[PDB]
């Protein structure tokens, strides 16, 4: 908790996500496994998410 209210809250997770695959070039295929995270019970008019650094340097 910074003195001006700016909070910081990190967790250590082990996410097992779904990566839909089109195995039509097996085994010479390329995939793009996504990881979508958003808010529950809070719409856009209330809680908006944003990357903290340049979007190329966040993940």
């Amino acid at each position: 908790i910074t003195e001006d209210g700016t909070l910081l809250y990190t967790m250590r997770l082990t996410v097992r996500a779904e990566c839909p695959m089109h195995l039509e070039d097996f085994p010479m295929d390329a995939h793009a496994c996504p990881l979508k995270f958003g808010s529950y019970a809070y719409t856009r008019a209330e809680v908006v998410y944003e990357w903290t650094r340049e979007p190329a340097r966040s993940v």
Partner: antibody, heavy 117, light 106 residues
Framework: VQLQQSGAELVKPGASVKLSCTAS????????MYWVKQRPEQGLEWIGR????????KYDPKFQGKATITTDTFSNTAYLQLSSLTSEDTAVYYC???????????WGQGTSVTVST | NIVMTQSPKSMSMSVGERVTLSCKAS??????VSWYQQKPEQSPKLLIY???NRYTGVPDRFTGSGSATDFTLTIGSVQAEDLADYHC????????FGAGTKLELK
């Protein structure tokens, strides 16, 4: 909400100019602060950005060392100092804050510098 | 370094017709391309933050269209105060702007 830049400068080639950008209406610790240059009748060009909470400043590779970006959180000001300048950077310098989707919503007004003798 | 090739360089169009401008990015920029409207002797004003999201106070005649590399700004019924430059600038990486299009009337 309202960015007040400095006035125009008339500087001799080979000196250092320090342009100021006072942010009124918010705290600079919340957002970033981008500096943009614009030569007359040409496209915009990025100079560098600064994170006023830490002091992490990134510059364009062709602007590293020539320009430096510092801040002052007490007066809510961003300073851009051009270390060594030639007679070519007679452009208009804008000060902007990052917006919602990393756009620059609020821009300054431009301190049109002039390098001559 | 991501470069934004904005087209066309300078177009001339009459009042009341639909107009479209294109901004092709070199590398990938997801939806972080913003469109600014710079009138002469004034500071640029943000029109479209993100792809297809108008900024507060922008008329509904401006519409964006986003993709991975190509982005489009369509103006509908064009009024008489829309004679200005229109820069496209990504923000997915360190921001690099386009060359801009000097809009003209004819």
């Amino acid at each position: 909400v309202q960015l007040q830049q400095s006035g125009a400068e008339l500087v001799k080639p080979g000196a250092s100019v320090k342009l100021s950008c006072t942010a009124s209406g918010f705290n600079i610790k919340d957002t970033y602060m981008y500096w943009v240059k614009q030569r007359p009748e040409q496209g915009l060009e990025w100079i560098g950005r600064i994170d006023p909470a830490n002091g992490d400043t990134k510059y364009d590779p062709k602007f590293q060392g020539k320009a430096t970006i510092t801040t002052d959180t007490f007066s809510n000001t961003a300073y851009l100092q051009l270390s060594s300048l030639t007679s070519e950077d007679t452009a208009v310098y804008y000060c902007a804050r990052k917006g919602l989707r990393w756009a620059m919503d609020y821009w300054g007004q431009g301190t049109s510098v002039t390098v001559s003798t | 370094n991501i470069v934004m090739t904005q087209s066309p360089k300078s177009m001339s169009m009459s009042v009341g017709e639909r107009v479209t401008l294109s901004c092709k990015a070199s590398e990938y920029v997801g939806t972080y391309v913003s469109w600014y409207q710079q009138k002469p002797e004034q500071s640029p004003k943000l029109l479209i933050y993100g792809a297809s999201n108008r900024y507060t106070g922008v008329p509904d005649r401006f519409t964006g269209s986003g993709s991975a590399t190509d982005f489009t700004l369509t103006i509908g019924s064009v009024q008489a105060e829309d004679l200005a430059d229109y820069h496209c600038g990504q923000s997915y990486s360190y921001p690099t702007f386009g060359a801009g299009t000097k809009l003209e009337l004819k």
